[PDB]
Curated annotation (Swiss-Prot):
GO terms for cellular component: cytoplasm. The keyword Repressor does not apply. Keywords: Lectin. It comes from the Eukaryota. One of its GO terms (molecular function) is carbohydrate binding. The chain holds residues 38 to 171 of 171 of the full protein. Does not bind lactose, and may not bind carbohydrates. It comes from Gallus gallus. Residues 1-133 form the Galectin domain. This is Galectin-related protein. The lineage of its organism: Eukaryota, Metazoa, Chordata, Craniata, Vertebrata.
Length: 134
């Protein structure tokens, strides 16, 4: 798995760009914004985005002190295709993240972790090749 540092953490108006290529026979991948890079014990998770290909879900949740929140799943469509490039953009606003895939807003996620400047790590894992981070 991969960790990228976000200098200064998140703040309103800041946008994280992730581009990659989905694997040919994917099961799932994840893109998370976390408070630090620790894997053991796991850093608190401000937002995890998990693409699950078997039932075409794009699920979101947060994790604080080991406790996951309420999973959110509403989607207009499942935006990823095996073997195809994608662009995910996470826009931070004061009340919420807004998530865009290939330029289109898919959903918002209202902050559970409200110390946005502590959200200083992007973690990427699973059945993709990561091609750009910005």
């Amino acid at each position: 798995p991969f960790c990228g540092h976000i200098k200064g953490g998140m703040r309103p108006g800041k946008k994280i760009l992730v581009m990659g290529i989905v694997d040919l026979n994917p099961e799932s991948f994840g893109i998370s914004l976390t408070c630090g890079e620790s894997e053991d014990p796991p850093a608190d998770v401000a937002i995890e985005l998990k693409a699950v290909f078997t039932d075409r879900q794009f699920i979101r949740n947060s994790c604080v002190a080991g406790e996951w929140g309420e999973e959110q799943s509403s989607i207009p469509y499942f935006p990823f295709i095996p073997d195809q490039p994608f662009r995910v953009e996470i826009l931070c606003e004061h009340p919420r993240f807004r998530i865009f895939v290939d330029g289109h807003q898919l959903f918002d996620f209202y902050h559970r972790i409200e110390t946005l400047s502590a959200i200083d790590t992007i973690k990427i894992n699973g059945d993709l090749q990561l091609t750009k981070l910005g």
